[PDB]
From Swiss-Prot:
Name the record gives this protein: Mitotic checkpoint serine/threonine-protein kinase BUB1 beta
Motif (Nuclear localization signal): 51-58
Function: Essential component of the mitotic checkpoint. Required for normal mitosis progression. The mitotic checkpoint delays anaphase until all chromosomes are properly attached to the mitotic spindle. One of its checkpoint functions is to inhibit the activity of the anaphase-promoting complex/cyclosome (APC/C) by blocking the binding of CDC20 to APC/C, independently of its kinase activity. The other is to monitor kinetochore activities that depend on the kinetochore motor CENPE. Required for kinetochore localization of CENPE.
BUB1 N-terminal domain residues: 6-160
PTM entry text: Proteolytically cleaved by caspase-3 in a cell cycle specific manner. The cleavage might be involved in the durability of the cell cycle delay. Caspase-3 cleavage is associated with abrogation of the mitotic checkpoint.
Induction: Induced during mitosis.
Record region (Necessary for interaction with KNL1): 92-125
Amino acid sequence: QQKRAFEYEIRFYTGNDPLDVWDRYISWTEQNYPQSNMSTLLERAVEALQGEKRYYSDPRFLNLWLKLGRLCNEPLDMYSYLHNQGIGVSLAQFYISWAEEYEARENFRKADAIFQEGIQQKAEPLERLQSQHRQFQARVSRQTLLALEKEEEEEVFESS
Ligand SMILES: [Pr+3]
Ligand SMILES: [Pr+3]
């Protein structure tokens, strides 16, 4: 076949950037199986890298967790945990992703708090975080104005 799975799996990895192997292996998987053993590769990468403070600001490390969060049925608990470990906390995408989960559940005040914390931390790229924050706010504001229109319409019906 193509058990390149074997080529990656042969971890007599002796270098100083272990995340590198996994990054390439994860990337290979989503490039060959666009939907895969993916979810158990991700769990393995993360466990292999469990407690490694040095990668807590690495976008390749955060990317593992964003991919897991997408598959996970409890991502909110996942982000809370990562935040307590200080994983991804200096990265804009960590906050964008966490806030989007709350926005999806219509908890706009929590999503906003997450953006604002990321901004106060000046998580990188800050301009991506600010842009996404403004887009989020605009979505909520627009949804509100349309909702209010539907309320006003029904309410006005009730008065006849
Ligand atoms: Pr009514
Ligand atoms: Pr009423």
